[PDB]
Design a binder for this molecule. Structure first.
Ligand code: CLA
Ligand code: CLA
Ligand code: CLA
Ligand code: CLA
Ligand code: CLA
Ligand code: CLA
Ligand code: CLA
Ligand code: CLA
Ligand code: CLA
Ligand SMILES: CC1=C(/C=C/C(C)=C/C=C\C(C)=C\C=C\C=C(C)\C=C\C=C(C)\C=C\C2=C(C)CCCC2(C)C)C(C)(C)CCC1
Ligand code: SF4
Ligand SMILES: [Ca+2]
Lengths: 74, 165, 39, 37, 733, 80, 63, 74
């Protein structure tokens, strides 16, 4: 199994479901969840660097899990 | 069979234990005469031992590696392998007698509670009322279930004293 | 006799008679049914 | 190395058992009975 | 007049009696009760105390390492860890005569030394220590770390370094950093040590600070990790003929899940432990990103708590307001922490004896007995502390107006039902366990052992059969070969696990019978009764029908006087006091059971335990009387041996216990009158009245008496059992 | 010194004052009970904390309460 | 005339009282402006051996 | 209790015993003049050694004593 294809696909897929699917739900839950730093971005949907890092972390973890499971040959 | 145990009717340690008990009893019996009271008492004890071992092996009890019987407490195993007489039937028997005594005492307390001096009826037992309730307590599960369905078995929250929290 | 029956109806006398009856019943049961371990 | 000498227990055990407890006991006892101004 | 000590209480300082010293010593850590105490200062004092405790722990660890490297025989014990006894430290006692010097001279030493029972030798040998130089370096490093912690504790109290009150209440940040950093990064670092040092050292390759930067832990060198082919790391593991410490039969794998135990050391595989630490490190690191701190994403514990109320109204207001009543109450947090710590400690004791993690630890019987007993007693004390702090929370930090209708208020709403049901469970367990034991005792006394009641523990045996044990014959789950649960682990970990659980020579799920069933019921009785006393004392701490205003008297006070029939031991402190005895009794039963079962297993006769554990006479004669013959023979008119110290400790603990009985039975008044007579005698004696006291002599207070008696009781109990356990296990093996 | 407090439920029965063995309590005029008297504690510096007054109080709950405070020579009842 | 009738049965609502949520017979109601004019006598005594107490107008509910 | 313990040990050690040919043998062998000066001697030779009869009495005519020996500890 190609690691580059799996990692790239997993990261891009979870970033896509985070930007176009679960963005509104996450924003609505974060608002009701209620010294800090405001991360302003030019994204029209407010997809800042923090959300990118979180979704990319989830995508990389899932991609590496898939690669490991396929590496075990089971 | 169950939990690696063998029936007492086919256990070697069980028979060896019975032979050990009969051997020590016979050894103690050899020091007396034949028509004396201690000899008759020892022979009676030996007969009791033989009957006890025969009855335990006849009941189908499960013995361990020590030659002693074991009880089956699981309702499924007891009702599936013929061991309901160990712990199931005596459990329901105790439940009947326990609820019997509890219901008789509860009925006596509730009956003497509405009288002028209940403390006198508590230290000095009213034998006629207690005897009547003792004889009437045979239908305790039926009366208790009927009391529970009517809502009269329990007392309300507002009528019970509690701490100031 | 009323006072004597009232004295016999007290808690210790009733407890003594009841426990004697229960103990006697259990002893006689084990006497006529030696070594009952199961049903 | 960090290895202590052979005579180290013969000097540290009597110290920790008689020198240090006596000084500590005397100092603490004097401190407890100190009267406030 | 007013003395300088104590400085935190002017009322105690004005006390002109001996009660001032005792009370000042017993209330020094009660920071909330000092003079002029605020919340910020309170938290700062606790922060400094935490640093001081950490420094003490690290210095103690460094001292152990230093003594093992100096007076121990670690360099010789690693070559023969089966026939060589470990050495704790040397003995320099001028009171020892010639027989004591030659009696304690053992273990290949040149003088009198103590044989260790702590098991640090096996642990250090398993993690990678081989020479005394390693222990010396570790001791120096830990001493310097302890010094840094002490300096940090002093530095954080000075101005420009004291944390603010809001900093101490940052629950989200603190919990995220502890889950990701203190738990995940620490576990990841331990995985790195196991893969880089422990695993290569166990295969005969010395890897240290001088050569770890040039030695590869795996022949592929980090390539399978980056390429996602992690399955290559489990290739070529240690074979069944591997010798610990050498390269004979050693594999090249670093992360496996073979399961079971090592065939020689009878301990867990190092590769499996490293893999375990890596997996839990990944889980803890991921869990460290759950709460919102400063980047928008995350959660708020208050929102999760307030959003957990059932619609049916079964829990009332649910968990509303729980965030404020916990974050603002230090006793609640301490009680939760102590409860979790005690449970984890018990978990550690059970998992370490059943699943030995250190090499050549199962063969050391004394180490197993001492470690299990030590952890179980510590866990019992910690649990009692958790419940005590819960009672302290109810009296000092509970606010009914803020906690209105939530689960916390509903606990006090139906506390009578809880105490009543706990009483019923304890009564049922006590009556039945005692009745079955007395019945079995009478049957054994009358010569009819077949008439005793022996209930087979079918539930626990069924669980064991589910785990893979085929001795009972249930043949299901991991016991049946045609089950999916069995066939799904045959390629990962089930072979080694089944081979280790089916072996009756280890402590992995031992065979149980009627004696185990009965002693387990006794354990349940002890747990339920201890819980009953603690729970009742915590719920009745704010008041009951006898004392409707107990919350206004504090957590600890003597009584309410002899009025209302008597109010002896009415405070929550007294409930904890009575619960300590039940905790000691419960741990005594569990440790007695553990020691007897393992003694009969190590002696090769488990039938002795199986046949004598059903009647109390067997426990008193075959366990307490049979195993103390060598202990009490340590010193006699015919001479003495190395076991005389344990005999002296045995009698020492008995004396301390009996001394505690004095403070427990006799009460203050008699002693105060006696003291008054002694005061008159000293005041009217010539050549001696010139030396007058600075503190007026008075009898110990009621609370102080209870604490002193409890302390003597616990110390004597602990020392007596520890001496008997170590002496019996060491003499027998 | 110990803290002695009198609550408004005092019926002015004067039993707590008679039971006090060190002359701490007394009776003052009042308008909240039929007896028109109320217990007072103006000499708490001599109270030892025997709680005899609490035993002698007949109200439910008690009207006089004793809270153990700072111990001194008079509070510990020492003759030396 | 204010308060419960003499000889009636009332429930105690005072939480710190020993007879909280218990029935007691009314003895006498004081006609002055005292805080606790109702006198309630109970068959069961408290821990101090007392069977009578004084309660306020709102501290007792008819039951 | 200490009085009766001293009486029992002294009588069983230096007074009571069988009569053999040219010599008198006591129950415990006269160990009171050598083992009663220590607490360990009292606990081992008088309490641990002499309690063997009451703990193994089960199955004989003295078994009741053993039962009471346990009951009294309760
Ligand atoms: C007090 C707690 C308690 C405990 C710890 C157990 C424990 C056990 N029971 Mg059980 N049981 C209990 C109360 C309890 N029982 C009560 C109060 C009743 C009366 C209703 C029953 C009636 C009962 C029956 C009829 C059976 C068991 C059985 C079992 C054993 C396996 C089934 C199981 O774990 O699921 C829990 C048990 C139940 C929820 C009861 C229903 C039975 C389930 C559905 C299992 C049946 C499937 C099959 C027969 C399992 C056998 C597989 C293989 C060995 C052939 C197990 C050791 C089974 C057994 O081993 O047969 C000998 C069995 O058939 N029990
Ligand atoms: C009318 C008699 C009666 C009844 C119906 C109950 C019922 C109950 N008791 Mg109780 N109890 C009783 C008498 C009674 N008790 C007496 C006399 C005592 C003093 C020894 C106690 C002491 C007691 C304690 C300490 C506890 C209970 C508890 C309980 C509850 C749990 C069940 C249980 O079996 O506990 C156990 C029952 C006992 C230990 C005592 C049983 C004594 C006998 C068998 C009862 C009848 C005796 C009486 C002389 C006969 C009436 C004579 C009359 C016909 C002339 C239950 C509702 C538990 C609880 O708090 O509730 C959850 C609990 O902890 N009881
Ligand atoms: C809670 C503990 C407990 C339990 C469960 C038991 C249970 C039992 N004991 Mg035991 N015993 C105990 C405590 C206990 N004992 C203690 C503490 C002692 C010391 C004093 C003894 C001393 C003892 C002796 C000396 C003997 C027993 C015997 C027995 C068995 C007799 C059954 C019977 O009486 O026939 C049946 C009872 C009835 C039919 C009465 C029924 C009641 C009415 C009439 C009917 C209602 C039913 C519906 C039984 C299984 C006997 C035995 O043979 O052992 C096997 C026996 O010899 N016990
Ligand atoms: C907490 C850890 C600890 C413990 C329990 C012990 C225990 C012991 N040590 Mg050891 N020691 C330790 C740490 C420790 N040491 C360290 C880290 C060093 C390296 C500096 C040494 C160096 C050392 C030597 C050279 C010797 C001992 C010896 C001994 C034994 C004699 C008694 C004694 O105290 O001697 C003295 C102990 C010391 C000099 C260490 C004290 C230095 C630390 C930094 C002070 C700690 C302060 C403390 C925490 C404050 C509270 C304590 C108290 C005031 C309440 C005794 C069994 C002697 C021996 O072998 O007997 C046969 C001996 O010769 N120790
Ligand atoms: C914890 C540390 C500790 C240490 C290091 C010692 C050391 C010693 N003890 Mg001691 N002891 C201790 C604790 C200690 N004890 C405790 C806690 C108790 C109470 C249970 C006792 C009760 C005790 C008794 C009853 C006796 C000893 C005796 C002795 C001496 C053994 C005699 C011998 O064979 O050598 C040879 C003896 C000598 C070479 C003579 C040395 C003279 C002294 C000891 C040194 C010089 C005095 C010094 C200048 C002053 C130091 C005080 C200082 C704190 C200011 C020895 C030097 C015996 C003794 O005193 O000898 C007569 C003895 O009778 N001890
Ligand atoms: C990643 C950053 C980080 C790290 C590493 C730490 C680390 C630590 N903090 Mg800290 N903290 C942080 C961030 C961090 N904090 C932040 C950002 C805040 C502000 C919001 C705080 C606020 C804070 C406070 C208020 C306190 C601490 C405290 C502590 C110490 C806890 C002491 C302890 O329990 O031992 C270490 C605990 C563990 C290693 C976890 C053990 C897990 C279980 C219990 C054991 C299982 C392991 C294994 C099986 C056992 C090994 C066996 C064998 C080897 C013996 C600890 C050293 C306390 C302190 O200051 O002490 C001085 C404390 O009071 N911190
Ligand atoms: C993380 C653990 C922890 C922490 C931080 C605390 C913290 C606190 N506890 Mg606590 N507690 C704990 C665990 C803990 N506890 C445990 C495990 C128990 C069960 C044993 C208790 C039971 C407990 C009670 C009952 C009470 C407290 C109280 C207190 C508070 C102040 C009292 C104090 O500590 O003064 C200083 C502590 C002492 C001076 C200890 C007393 C001396 C002991 C008995 C030493 C004896 C050992 C002996 C000498 C061993 C040597 C033997 C050898 C020579 C042979 C304080 C906030 C008190 C309180 O809240 O005030 C109202 C209170 O009453 N605790
Ligand atoms: C061997 C000593 C001993 C024994 C037997 C007990 C027993 C008991 N304790 Mg206790 N405890 C002890 C020591 C002991 N404690 C000590 C030293 C302390 C520290 C002060 C405590 C502190 C303590 C507290 C704080 C509490 C208990 C509680 C209990 C009860 C728990 C319920 C139970 O298990 O039901 C089983 C019942 C029994 C074991 C009673 C024995 C049955 C007898 C032998 C049968 C009667 C014999 C025969 C029929 C008649 C003979 C009498 C004759 C004169 C005619 C129980 C009766 C808890 C409680 O009250 O529960 C509600 C409670 O809260 N204990
Ligand atoms: C084994 C436990 C124990 C012990 C040691 C004591 C000890 C004592 N009791 Mg006591 N008592 C006990 C149990 C015990 N009792 C119990 C359970 C109760 C409840 C019923 C009582 C009730 C009681 C009463 C009512 C009275 C006493 C009195 C006394 C004192 C009598 C004076 C004496 O004997 O001279 C000598 C002292 C001893 C023998 C105690 C041991 C001293 C050791 C052996 C010396 C060791 C010294 C050592 C070197 C110290 C160094 C320390 C080192 C760490 C630095 C004495 C201290 C009486 C009293 O007040 O005094 C007249 C008194 O009237 N007791
Ligand atoms: C008083 C108080 C308190 C409390 C305390 C406590 C609460 C204690 C306790 C206790 C405890 C100490 C507990 C514990 C517990 C545990 C649990 C609850 C568990 C569990 C389990 C499970 C769930 C499991 C499962 C399983 C199995 C079965 C096996 C295999 C695996 C698995 C997972 C599957 C506080 C302080 C808070 C405050 C307030 C007051
Ligand atoms: S005893 Fe109570 S009610 Fe009577 S006068 Fe004193 S404080 Fe008031
Ligand atoms: Ca090395």
């Amino acid at each position: 199994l190609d690691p580059q294809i799996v990692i790239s696909g997993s990261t891009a897929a979870f970033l896509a479901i985070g930007r176009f699917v679960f963005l509104g739900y996450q924003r609505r839950e974060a608002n009701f969840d209620s010294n800090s730093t405001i991360f302003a971005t030019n994204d029209p949907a407010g997809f800042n660097i923090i959300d990118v890092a979180g979704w990319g972390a989830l995508g990389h973890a899932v991609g590496f899990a898939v690669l490991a499971i396929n590496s075990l040959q089971g | 069979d169950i939990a690696g145990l063998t029936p007492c009717s086919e256990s070697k340690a069980y028979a060896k234990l019975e032979k050990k008990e009969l051997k020590t009893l016979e050894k103690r019996l050899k020091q007396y005469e034949a028509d004396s009271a201690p000899a008759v008492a020892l022979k009676a004890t030996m007969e009791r031992t033989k009957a006890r071992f025969a009855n335990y092996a006849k009941a189908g009890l499960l013995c361990g590696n020590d030659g002693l019987p074991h009880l089956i407490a699981d309702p499924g195993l007891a009702l599936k392998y013929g061991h309901a007489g160990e712990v199931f039937i005596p459990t329901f028997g105790f439940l009947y007698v326990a609820g019997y005594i509890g219901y008789v005492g509860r009925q006596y307390l509730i009956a003497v509670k509405g009288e002028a001096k209940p403390t006198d009826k508590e230290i000095i037992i009213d034998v006629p009322l207690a005897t009547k309730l003792a004889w009437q307590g045979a239908g305790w599960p039926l009366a208790a279930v009927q009391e529970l369905q009517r809502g009269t078995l329990l007392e309300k929250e507002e009528n019970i004293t509690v701490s100031p929290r | 006799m009323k006072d004597f029956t009232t004295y016999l109806s007290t808690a210790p006398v009733i407890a003594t008679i009841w426990f004697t009856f229960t103990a006697g019943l259990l002893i006689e049961i084990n006497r006529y049914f030696p070594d009952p371990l199961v049903f | 190395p960090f290895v202590p000498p052979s005579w180290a227990p013969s000097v540290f055990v009597p110290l920790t058992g008689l020198v240090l407890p006596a000084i500590a006991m005397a100092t603490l006892f004097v401190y407890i009975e100190k009267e406030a101004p | 007049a007013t003395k300088l000590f104590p400085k935190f209480s002017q009322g105690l300082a004005q006390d002109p009696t001996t009660r001032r010293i005792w009370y000042g010593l017993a209330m020094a850590h009660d920071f909330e009760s000092h003079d002029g105490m605020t919340e910020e200062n309170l938290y700062q004092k606790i922060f400094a105390s935490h640093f001081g405790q950490l420094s003490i722990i690290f210095l103690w660890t460094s001292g152990n390492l230093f003594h093992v490297a100096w007076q121990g025989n670690f360099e010789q014990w690693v070559t023969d860890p089966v026939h060589i006894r470990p050495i704790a430290h040397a003995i320099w006692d001028p009171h020892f005569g010639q027989p004591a010097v030659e009696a304690f001279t053992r273990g290949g030493a040149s003088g009198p030394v103590n044989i260790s029972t702590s098991g640090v030798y096996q642990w250090w040998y398993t993690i990678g220590m081989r020479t005394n130089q390693d222990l010396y370096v570790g001791s120096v490093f830990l001493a310097l770390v302890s010094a840094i912690f002490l300096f940090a504790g002093w530095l954080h109290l000075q101005p420009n370094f004291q944390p603010s009150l809001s900093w101490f209440k940052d629950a989200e940040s603190r919990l995220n950093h502890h889950l990701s950093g203190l738990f995940g990064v620490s576990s990841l670092a331990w995985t790195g040590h196991l893969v880089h040092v422990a695993i290569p050292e166990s295969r005969g390759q010395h890897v240290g600070w001088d050569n770890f930067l040039s030695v590869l832990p795996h022949p592929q060198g980090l390539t399978p990790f980056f390429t996602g082919n992690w399955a290559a790391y489990a290739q070529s593991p240690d074979t069944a003929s591997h010798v610990f410490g050498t390269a004979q039969g050693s594999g090249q794998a670093i992360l496996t899940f073979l399961g079971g135990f090592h065939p020689q050391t009878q301990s867990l595989w190092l590769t499996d432990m490293a893999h375990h630490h890596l997996a839990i490190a990944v889980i803890f690191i991921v869990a460290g990103h759950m709460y919102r701190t400063n980047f928008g994403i995350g959660h708020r514990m208050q929102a999760i708590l307030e959003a957990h109320t059932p619609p049916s109204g079964s829990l009332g207001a649910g968990h509303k307001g729980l965030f404020d009543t916990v974050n603002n109450s230090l006793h609640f947090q301490l009680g939760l922490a102590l409860a979790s710590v005690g449970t984890i400690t018990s978990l550690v004791a059970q998992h370490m004896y059943s699943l030995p993690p250190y090499a050549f630890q199962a063969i050391d019987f004394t180490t197993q007995a001492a470690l299990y007993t030590h952890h179980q007693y510590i866990a019992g004390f910690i649990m009692c502390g958790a419940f005590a702090h819960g009672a302290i929370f109810f009296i000092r930090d509970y606010d009914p107006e803020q906690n209105k209708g939530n689960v916390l208020a509903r606990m006090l709403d139906h506390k009578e039902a809880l105490i009543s049901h706990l009483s019923w469970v304890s009564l049922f367990l006590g009556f039945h366990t005692l009745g079955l034991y007395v019945h079995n005792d009478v049957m054994q006394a009358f010569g009819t052992p077949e008439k005793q009641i022996l209930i087979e523990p079918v539930f626990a045996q069924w669980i064991q059969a589910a785990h893979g044990k085929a001795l009972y014959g249930f043949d299901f789950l991991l016991s049946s070969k045609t089950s999916a649960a069995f066939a799904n682990g045959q390629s990962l970990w089930l072979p080694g696990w089944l081979d280790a659980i089916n072996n009756n020579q280890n402590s992995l799920f031992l065979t149980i019978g009627p004696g185990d069933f009965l002693v387990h019921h006794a354990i349940a009785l002890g747990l339920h009764t201890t819980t009953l006393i603690l729970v009742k004392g915590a719920l009745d701490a704010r008041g009951s029908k006898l004392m409707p205003d107990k919350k206004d008297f504090g957590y600890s006070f003597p009584c309410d006087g002899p009025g209302r029939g008597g109010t002896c031991d009415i405070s929550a402190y007294d409930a904890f006091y009575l619960a300590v005895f039940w905790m000691l009794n419960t741990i005594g039963w569990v440790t007695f059971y553990w020691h007897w079962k393992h003694l009969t297993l190590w002696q090769g006769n488990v039938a002795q335990f199986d046949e004598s554990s059903t009647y109390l006479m067997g426990w008193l004669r075959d366990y307490l009387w049979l195993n103390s013959s060598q202990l009490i023979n340590g010193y006699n008119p015919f001479g003495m041996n190395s076991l005389s110290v344990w005999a002296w400790t045995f009698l020492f603990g008995h004396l301390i216990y009996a001394t505690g009985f004095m403070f427990l039975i006799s009460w203050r008044g008699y002693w105060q009158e006696l003291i008054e007579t002694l005061v008159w005698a000293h005041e009217k004696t010539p050549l001696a009245n010139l030396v007058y006291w600075k503190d007026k002599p008075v009898a110990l207070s009621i609370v102080q008496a209870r604490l002193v008696g409890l302390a003597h009781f616990s110390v004597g109990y602990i020392f007596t059992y520890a001496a008997f356990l170590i002496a019996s296990t060491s003499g027998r093996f | 010194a110990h803290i002695v407090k009198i609550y408004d439920t005092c019926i002015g029965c004067t039993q707590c004052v008679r039971a006090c063995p060190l002359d701490v309590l007394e009776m003052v005029p009042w308008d909240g009970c039929k007896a028109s008297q109320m217990a007072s504690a103006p000499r708490t510096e001599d109270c030892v904390g025997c709680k005899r007054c609490e035993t002698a109080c007949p109200t439910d709950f008690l009207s006089v309460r004793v809270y153990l405070g700072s111990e001194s020579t008079r509070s510990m009842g020492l003759s030396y | 005339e204010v308060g419960p009738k003499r000889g009636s049965l009332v429930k105690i609502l005072r939480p710190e009282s020993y007879w909280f949520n218990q029935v007691g017979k009314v003895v006498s109601v004081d006609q002055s402006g005292v805080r606790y004019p109702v006198v309630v006598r109970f068959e069961n005594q408290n821990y101090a051996g007392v069977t009578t107490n004084n309660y306020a107008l709102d501290e007792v509910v008819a039951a | 209790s200490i009085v009766i313990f001293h009486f029992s040990w002294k009588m069983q050690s230096d007074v009571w015993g069988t009569v053999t040919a040219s010599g008198v043998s006591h129950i415990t062998g006269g160990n009171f003049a050598q083992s009663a000066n220590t607490i360990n001697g009292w606990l081992r030779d008088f309490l641990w050694a002499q309690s063997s009869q009451v703990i193994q009495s089960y199955g004989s005519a003295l078994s009741a004593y053993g039962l009471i020996f346990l009951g009294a500890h309760f």
